[PDB]
Design a protein around this ligand. Sequence first.
Ligand SMILES: Nc1ccccc1N1CCOCC1
Ligand SMILES: Nc1ccccc1N1CCOCC1
Ligand SMILES: Nc1ccccc1N1CCOCC1
Ligand SMILES: Nc1ccccc1N1CCOCC1
Ligand SMILES: [Zn+2]
Ligand SMILES: [Zn+2]
Ligand SMILES: [Zn+2]
Ligand SMILES: [Zn+2]
Lengths: 360, 360
Amino acid sequence: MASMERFLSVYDEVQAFLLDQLQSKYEIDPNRARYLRIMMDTTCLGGKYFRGMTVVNVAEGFLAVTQHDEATKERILHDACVGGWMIEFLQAHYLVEDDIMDGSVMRRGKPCWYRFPGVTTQCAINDGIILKSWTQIMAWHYFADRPFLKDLLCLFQKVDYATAVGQMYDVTSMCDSNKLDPEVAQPMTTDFAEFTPAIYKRIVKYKTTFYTYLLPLVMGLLVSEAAASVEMNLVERVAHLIGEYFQVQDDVMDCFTPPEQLGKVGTDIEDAKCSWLAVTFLGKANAAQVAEFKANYGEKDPAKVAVVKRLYSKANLQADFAAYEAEVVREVESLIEQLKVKSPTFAESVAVVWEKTHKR
Amino acid sequence: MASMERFLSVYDEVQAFLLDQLQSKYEIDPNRARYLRIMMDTTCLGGKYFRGMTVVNVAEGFLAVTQHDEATKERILHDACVGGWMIEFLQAHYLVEDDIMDGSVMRRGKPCWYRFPGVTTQCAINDGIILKSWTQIMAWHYFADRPFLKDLLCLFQKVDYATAVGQMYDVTSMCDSNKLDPEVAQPMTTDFAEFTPAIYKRIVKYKTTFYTYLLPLVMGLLVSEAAASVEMNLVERVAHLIGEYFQVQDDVMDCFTPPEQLGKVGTDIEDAKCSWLAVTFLGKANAAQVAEFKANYGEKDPAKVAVVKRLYSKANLQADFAAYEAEVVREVESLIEQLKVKSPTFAESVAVVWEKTHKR
Ligand SMILES: Nc1ccccc1N1CCOCC1
Ligand SMILES: Nc1ccccc1N1CCOCC1
Ligand SMILES: Nc1ccccc1N1CCOCC1
Ligand SMILES: Nc1ccccc1N1CCOCC1
Ligand SMILES: [Zn+2]
Ligand SMILES: [Zn+2]
Ligand SMILES: [Zn+2]
Ligand SMILES: [Zn+2]
């Protein structure tokens, strides 16, 4: 059975389990089940399933080198699919809530969930809660007796919390830290002192890298009972590095990729986001450029957003990006090599994770 | 040491642990730690701590009859305090998110969190996420090696998910079920066919009773290693019954308790909530009363809200409430007695839970 068809089939299985349980145990009526079914589909499906399929790919790597009964290979692959769905649903939680937080319009060429006519924010906040609750219901049902259950739950928990901390870093990235105060409405930074590579790295490490790269790799290790084939400090290091590169790419696309192919009108500039473009631009700009950036960034006025795009175009940020890309290629190659000392197989899965990221 | 001082001290301990960990492990800066400290205080403190203190009270009941070393009594009480905080923080998550969902103004005489000037919805949604994440970080830290950890995490998980399902039942309670549809904006019911005692019971069972009464009782059993002193079907039954009565009281207060003592301008009528008052009124009204109710319910216009209050006043809902109260007293007394077959002690804690509810 091909990996993706397996993964998509387990989606159906898991959906039926969750909805059946709501009927048999939570007194749900068919109409509200249908609402939840549709919500699950609309929020969990239609992506590339990069995160969930990474769990499956890591598990298949180990299966190719490890002795097991056929029934055991099937159980491992079924666990890797369930685990991959837990990550997809965790992502779905964060996208639903983030889209509401940010007042986003579209995602992936379709309206954000909360904008659907029969949803609204009042329902969608809670729908997003349920999405994450489902990840736990999946875990406790399908992995009840599994030896990795504790480690899996503890890992998921930490990754979720890292993610929420990252969200906080992201939403507060255009404030001056010394001005944060629940009692006082927050002004936009005027000095941009906090738009540094290190501050940037912190936002991205927490907001994206733990759930997008660390969790799918480590979950693949856990459902394979293979966390001893690796040095976990190396898996963290490579996860954080690849994940940073992924976000840098997303940041550049927000600005320069056409909306119909982006899936989204990009608003990082209007939103005054600490993007890789802003940070890199400030890291090379002269006094005049810095002042022009300050007078135009974080404003909805299209003339001003086009002044910022003009500044980024003239500043030859392609050069800084090629240089960044080259260094990331060095370091990820170095880490893959360190990963071979303990597991060729696992190192190869990380290679494939890297190729899928670097090429897209 | 008195129970409450113990409980409040462990709040400080737990806060310091969470914030210290954010500094040492999540790269937080002091300003954002301060923001989180303030958020935690503002959202978790200032109530009566009924839920968390119930965990402590149940544990103290068992301590009085069970042989242990002093260090063991201290550890049990410290676990009951930590567990009680997990429930308080779970409540805080749900109040923050609910207040945003419902567009609420105040809670407990103070603005809802999201309305604070330096918070806003964008931050508050995520602050509420973090509140719940903290419950897990507490559990995994303080109970890492405890024999009840699995059962505690599995119980908490189920109670959380019940709660979210209850929220969904609540927010959709004024829609016609057969009209729920993410694609179509939802009209208010015109027939009120779904304003029944059984539908009401379902909303309340899930939205409030699992986290308010079932979880504090069962958590007290778990940190005491005493879940064998009880018949768990009886603990569920009594939890759901008491919790229903609690909500009935809250529903009546929303309408009739003065705002400065309610802590809140009540808006159940404008919000077209399936309240105990609406359901009970519809259960005794004549044709003319039903039609007048329909023409005025779920409208912001103060003249119409006062027409609904007029209808409830004239309908002698005090009588139906005394009758309800009397039956709840019967059944809760019957359940407490069934609870004595296996645990006098546990039955007495449920008695105290009931007195604190019935009198307030
Ligand atoms: N049979 C066996 C025994 C002990 C370890 C590994 C294996 N295999 C190597 C060939 O392909 C995977 C199974
Ligand atoms: N949050 C997380 C998830 C998975 C692995 C490790 C972590 N942490 C790294 C930094 O904070 C302490 C532990
Ligand atoms: N000492 C003892 C032995 C076996 C069971 C219970 C007890 N106690 C009864 C008196 O108060 C609580 C401790
Ligand atoms: N959600 C929950 C929490 C604590 C105990 C039991 C439950 N459930 C009762 C009905 O649904 C199945 C299990
Ligand atoms: Zn966002
Ligand atoms: Zn982006
Ligand atoms: Zn509400
Ligand atoms: Zn109320």
